[PDB]
Structure 1
Amino acid sequence: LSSSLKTCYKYLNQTSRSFAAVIQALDGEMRNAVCIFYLVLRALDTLEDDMTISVEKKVPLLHNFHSFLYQPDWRFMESKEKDRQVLEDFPTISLEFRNLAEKYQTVIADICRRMGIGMAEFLDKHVTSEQEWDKYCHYVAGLVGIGLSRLFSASEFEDPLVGEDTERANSMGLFLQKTNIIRDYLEDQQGGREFWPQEVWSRYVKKLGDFAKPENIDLAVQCLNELITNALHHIPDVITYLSRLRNQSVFNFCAIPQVMAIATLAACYNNQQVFKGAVKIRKGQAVTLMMDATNMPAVKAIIYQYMEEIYHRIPDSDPSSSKTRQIISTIRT
């Protein structure tokens, strides 16, 4: 297989870390299609994140990015982010995009079109309402769940419903993204980014950065528990989504990020450490999750164990407590 494709996989393992292995394990035509999609989304995110590119330039770039996929020489050299290689060596990635079957090209192209429009819209603003929080996550994450679902169906490995049920696919992306947002509070803080919805945090403090002050920790934990309770509402769709899948490799691919984020939410729940640094799950814990998350009954047992754990930790003085109890009861039945 081509020097071109060999270099895509090198980029995959350089950026994707532990996740590259899951992708290289996908059956058939799926492997290359997801690998290229992953790198293309990496390029788009990198442009979005790069604070050293002006809005005035950034906007047409996000808007037109779906087009660059068809332009053999397009590359971008003016970026200062960690993953700049994918942008600098874009023609290699876009060459291999253009080799995919047309049915996979047109999925990827359409998703990037719609993501770029969306990402441009939030260059300006902060996330104000819970409803805006969902719209932001749709653009940066729910759309990737939809795109991947359409590759699975178009390849004929999964039923057409998987490709068409956009609400369930969207929830796959929103659960992961909200979990990252919740866990990355301090890192984003320090980096000058603000993604927690104002409508929620403003019930507690005058400014988002106040949660990092030691006198605010009781209010910080309460807000945290409230956002965690928000994210839990996606779990029923997650279980429905995973339950429809039939290809083993696609199942492992989808199930694994989802159990890691369940474990992450459980570690974060009522946890003051979120506001003091980076709560991560242990490597041994993560490896076992990866090994065990390979069939619905296992994945369902994991979900249930971690929810029981959150359940028994719910304090009665917490303002979200009965909402938390409620969604966990739903999940459980």
Structure 2
Amino acid sequence: LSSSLKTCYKYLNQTSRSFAAVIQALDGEMRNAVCIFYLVLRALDTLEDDMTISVEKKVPLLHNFHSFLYQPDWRFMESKEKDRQVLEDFPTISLEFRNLAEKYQTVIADICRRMGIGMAEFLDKHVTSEQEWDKYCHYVAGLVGIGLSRLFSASEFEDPLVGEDTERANSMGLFLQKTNIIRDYLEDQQGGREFWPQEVWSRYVKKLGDFALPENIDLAVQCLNELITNALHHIPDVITYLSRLRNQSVFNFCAIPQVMAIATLAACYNNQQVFKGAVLIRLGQAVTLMMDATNMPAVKAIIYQYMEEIYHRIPDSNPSSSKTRQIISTIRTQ
């Protein structure tokens, strides 16, 4: 019955309109910690997003975002973004963050800390290579996974082992990030920002904007593919991660998203539409129709069912084949 909290949850259902629901399904003290944790990285991203802010001003701010969590009156008004309310009415968010147990604060604070540094590290440059494309996702998604993992263990609703495992807690983040990137391609383009790592989109066209050009379809799609064959390598980890979870609320919160992504990459795979406007996430076979993503055996089958939708449409003309099959063949025998 706290004005600040209610408002916090008003921002959660506002910005993170896809997780919101499951976040509110999290058991006990995990509920707020994550809700607030989502608002702050939502706010932290808005700052990094907002392009009407100088690089030499954004950088400082980015780096200290983690310090503002203890500045009762910190705030931002000059932000001209749709999610700018989180910045404007931040004090509300910081107040509640300030009522979170110390064990949860340390983590959230610590993650904003490094996420920031990293976000700034890629504020003047582009995603160079694959090897580099992971560093970025690690900063904007990976670290989030680690943070969430540490919150679970810290809440003692999950085994201490979920926190330790970060390599996988990271893949969990990299998979989604790479997914979204690869999904809303035109959106990022029509927005003034490039994200598809170079060294790969390069070997196709000269400017990853060409892909939005009609007489490109071929090189367009093909690139998309090998970009997906890259993301699919995170499945084995995503499966291992979830296989360790022992809390139902936590399982859903982690599982659902991962499954929407696979459903996404299975729809985006070789689907030209990925450049026209938007792709609809068509579901799986007439078997995974009686299986919700709430128990591991179900999840797996659901993944496998999607891996098939892909392995099925894999064209030989594609220079990304073989590997596409080499990865899916591994997710099958694991």
What band does the TM-score fall into relative to the shorter chain?
over 0.9
Deviations 1:187-242 (A, max 9, x none): 11111111111100110111111111211110111100000000000000000000
CA spacing shift, 1:213–1:290, aligned 2, 3 Å = farther
**How far 1:18 sits from its partner (Å)?**
3.5
Q: Return the alpha-carbon distance in structure 1 between the equivalents of residues 77 and 288 of structure 2.
A: 40
**How far 1:282 sits from its partner (Å)?**
5.8
Q: Return the alpha-carbon distance in structure 2 between the equivalents of residues 126 and 33 of structure 1.
A: 33
Deviations 1:275-331 (A, max 9, x none): 111213269999999981100000001000000110010001100100000100000
Deviations 1:28-85 (A, max 9, x none): 0000100000000110000000011111110110000000000101011110111111
CA contact (8 A) 1:152 1:163 kept: yes
TM-score computed with the length of structure 2 as normaliser: 0.97
**How far 1:172 sits from its partner (Å)?**
0.4
CA spacing shift, 1:287–1:250, aligned 2, 3 Å = farther
CA contact (8 A) 2:284 2:305 kept: no
CA spacing shift, 1:12–1:291, aligned 2, 3 Å = farther
CA spacing shift, 1:236–1:288, aligned 2, 3 Å = closer
Residue 149 of structure 1: aligned partner = 149
CA spacing shift, 1:289–1:105, aligned 2, 3 Å = farther
Q: Return the alpha-carbon distance in structure 1 between the equivalents of residues 98 and 68 of structure 2.
A: 11
Q: Percent identity?
A: 99
290-299 or 54-63: which moved more?
290-299
**How far 1:257 sits from its partner (Å)?**
0.4
Which stretches of structure 1, 4 residues or longer, exceed 4 Å deviation after superposition? Answer: 282-291
SS in structure 2 of the partner of residue 199 of structure 1? coil
Number of residue pairs matched by the alignment: 333
CA contact (8 A) 2:263 2:283 kept: no
CA spacing shift, 1:114–1:52, aligned 2, 3 Å = same
Q: Return the alpha-carbon distance in structure 1 between the equivalents of residues 212 and 189 of structure 2.
A: 9
CA spacing shift, 1:323–1:155, aligned 2, 3 Å = same
SS in structure 2 of the partner of residue 321 of structure 1? coil
CA spacing shift, 1:111–1:288, aligned 2, 3 Å = farther
CA contact (8 A) 2:210 2:216 kept: yes
Q: Return the alpha-carbon distance in structure 1 between the equivalents of residues 313 and 284 of structure 2.
A: 23
Q: Return the alpha-carbon distance in structure 1 between the equivalents of residues 218 and 273 of structure 2.
A: 12
CA contact (8 A) 1:260 1:286 kept: no
Q: Return the alpha-carbon distance in structure 2 between the equivalents of residues 147 and 190 of structure 1.
A: 31
Bigger proportion of residues as helix: 1
225-234 or 188-197: which moved more?
188-197
CA spacing shift, 1:325–1:137, aligned 2, 3 Å = same
Q: Return the alpha-carbon distance in structure 1 between the equivalents of residues 101 and 201 of structure 2.
A: 46
Alignment of 1:84-95 (within 5 A): 84-95=84-95
Q: Return the alpha-carbon distance in structure 1 between the equivalents of residues 121 and 330 of structure 2.
A: 35
SS in structure 2 of the partner of residue 70 of structure 1? coil
CA spacing shift, 1:62–1:166, aligned 2, 3 Å = same
Residue 161 of structure 2: aligned partner = 161
Q: Return the alpha-carbon distance in structure 1 between the equivalents of residues 295 and 70 of structure 2.
A: 39
SS in structure 1 of the partner of residue 123 of structure 2? helix
Residue 300 of structure 1: aligned partner = 300
Deviations 1:144-172 (A, max 9, x none): 00000000001111111100111000000
CA spacing shift, 1:283–1:222, aligned 2, 3 Å = closer
CA contact (8 A) 1:259 1:289 kept: no
Q: Return the alpha-carbon distance in structure 1 between the equivalents of residues 91 and 291 of structure 2.
A: 36
CA contact (8 A) 2:12 2:35 kept: yes
CA contact (8 A) 2:288 2:302 kept: no
CA contact (8 A) 2:59 2:120 kept: yes
290-299 or 141-150: which moved more?
290-299
TM-score computed with the length of structure 1 as normaliser: 0.97
